[PDB]
C-alpha cells in the first residue's frame, strides 16, 4: 500500500510467535503476516550489514523463485533495526538436523537432500547468481523434511571483516577451492566446490570438514592437492560425485546441471 515499494513489507502486518535462534545478523523469529501466513523474521543488528546495498539487491532476490530456494518475501526498511522476511522453515538449519542422530537417516534420504540443494543451485546457476557461501549451515529444512538453500549472496553485505577476508578468522576456508584461498577468484566453480563439501557434510551427518585441522592447515592441505575422503555412508558412486567438485582446475569441475543428472542416475541405480 501507500508508502511501500514491492520489496517492502509493513512491519505492522507482523505477529511475532516464537524466537527461533540467533545468527550472523542477530535474532530470528517465527511469526505470521496478516494473521495467516507463516514467516521467518530476521532482525538485522545495527552495524552488521551494508543495508542500502542489501536493499537494492533484495529487489533482485525477490525474483529468484524456485521450490528449493528459501523465498525472500520482502524487507522492513523504514526503521532500526531492519527486518528481512523469509519463507518459514520449521525444522531449522541443515547442519543441526544432520547432527540429530535420532533421525536414523537412510542413505536415500541423504541423497534426496543433496538433490534438493543441487536443484536450487542449478536454478541459481541458470540465473548467473552465485551463492558465495554454500554450506550446510546455510540450508534449512521444512516440516516435510525438504531441504532448501538460504541466504544466497548475502555474504556480499556482511561488514565484519573477519568473515569477508580470506585470511579472516571467520572466512569459510573449509568450503573454498584453491583459487579462492590463493587469489580470491570466485566463480560458478567455487560454488561447485562448496557443493561437494556440502555433500560431504550430509554424508558425514554434519561433521566439520577437515575436523582435525585448523583453517591454516586446511588451506595448506588443499592447496597441495589433497582432499576430504569418503564418508562411511557414501557409496562409491556418491563419493565420485562429490569428489568431482574438487578438481584443482576449476574448468574441469562439473556444472550443477551435470551434477543433478549424476545424482538422479545414482538415485535410479541405488
Ligand atoms: O529464513 C529462515 N526461514 N526459517 C528459518 C528458521 N527456521 C528455524 C527453526 C529452528 C531454528 C532456527 C530457524 N531458522 N530461517
Identify the CATH number of the domain in which residue 168 sits: 1.10.510.10
Cis, peptide link before residue 266, omega less than 30° from 0:
no
Q: Which of 111, 153, 57, 91 is nearest to 119 (CA)?
A: 111
- β-bridge partners, 39: 31
Cα–Cα dist 245/163, whole Å: 23
- β-bridge partners, 266: none
According to the annotation, is 224 in a ligand binding site? Answer: no
Query: Which mutation among 14, 31, 40 tests ligand 1's pocket best, with the greatest number of atoms within 8 A of CB?
Result: 40
Torsion sign over Cα 24, 25, 30, 32: negative
Residue with cell 547468481: 129
The strand ranges marked E within 133-237 are 139-141, 147-149
Q: Which entry of 38, 116, 133, 151 is annotated as an active-site residue?
A: 133
The CA-to-CA distance between both ends of the chain, in Å, stands at: 52
According to the annotation, is 110 in a ligand binding site? Answer: no
Task: Provide the experimental method for this PDB entry.
Answer: X-ray
How many Å lie between the centroid of ligand 1 and the Cα of residue 88?
6
How many Å lie between the centroid of ligand 1 and the Cα of residue 92?
5
Active site residue 151: no
Estimate the crossing angle of helix 188-203 against helix 107-126, to 10 degrees: 170
60-66 CB contacts, 8 Å cutoff, 24+ apart: 60/129, 61/152, 61/153, 62/6, 62/7, 64/123, 64/124, 64/127, 64/129, 64/152, 66/119, 66/120, 66/123, 66/124
Domain limits for position 119? 92-269
Cα–Cα dist 254/28, whole Å: 35
Pairing outcome for strands 72-76 and 37-43 = unpaired
123-128 CB contacts, 8 Å cutoff, 24+ apart: 123/64, 123/66, 123/68, 123/69, 124/64, 124/66, 124/69, 124/149, 124/152, 124/191, 124/256, 125/188, 125/191, 125/255, 125/256, 125/257, 127/64
Query: Which mutation among 61, 72, 84, 92 tests ligand 1's pocket best, with the greatest number of atoms within 8 A of CB?
Result: 92
Amino acid at each position: 500500500g501507500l508508502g511501500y515499494g514491492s520489496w517492502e513489507i509493513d512491519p505492522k502486518d507482523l505477529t511475532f510467535l516464537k524466537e527461533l535462534g540467533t545468527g550472523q545478523f542477530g535474532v530470528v523469529k517465527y511469526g505470521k503476516w496478516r494473521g495467516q501466513y507463516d514467516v521467518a523474521i530476521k532482525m538485522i543488528k545495527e552495524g552488521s550489514m551494508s543495508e542500502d546495498e542489501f536493499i537494492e539487491e533484495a529487489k533482485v532476490m525477490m525474483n529468484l523463485s524456485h521450490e528449493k530456494l528459501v523465498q525472500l518475501y520482502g524487507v522492513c526498511t523504514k526503521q532500526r533495526p531492519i527486518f528481512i522476511i523469509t519463507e518459514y522453515m520449521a525444522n531449522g538449519c541443515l547442519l543441526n538436523y544432520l547432527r540429530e542422530m535420532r533421525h536414523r537417516f537412510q542413505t536415500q534420504q541423504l541423497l534426496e537432500m543433496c538433490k534438493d540443494v543441487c536443484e536450487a543451485m542449478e536454478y541459481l546457476e541458470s540465473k548467473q547468481f552465485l551463492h558465495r557461501d554454500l554450506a550446510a549451515r546455510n540450508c534449512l529444512v521444512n516440516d516435510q523434511g525438504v531441504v532448501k538453500v538460504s541466504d544466497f549472496g548475502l555474504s556480499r553485505y556482511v561488514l565484519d571483516d573477519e568473515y569477508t577476508s580470506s585470511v579472516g578468522s571467520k572466512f569459510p576456508v573449509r568450503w573454498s577451492p584453491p583459487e579462492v584461498l590463493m587469489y580470491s577468484k570466485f566463480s560458478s566453480k567455487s560454488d561447485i566446490w562448496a557443493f561437494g563439501v556440502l555433500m560431504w557434510e550430509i554424508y558425514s551427518l554434519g561433521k566439520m570438514p577437515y575436523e582435525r585441522f585448523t583453517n591454516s592447515e586446511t588451506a595448506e592441505h588443499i592447496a597441495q592437492g589433497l582432499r576430504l575422503y569418503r564418508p562411511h555412508l557414501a557409496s562409491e558412486k556418491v563419493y565420485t560425485i562429490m569428489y568431482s567438485c574438487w578438481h584443482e582446475k576449476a574448468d574441469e569441475r562439473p556444472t550443477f546441471k551435470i551434477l543433478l543428472s549424476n545424482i538422479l542416475d545414482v538415485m535410479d541405480e541405488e
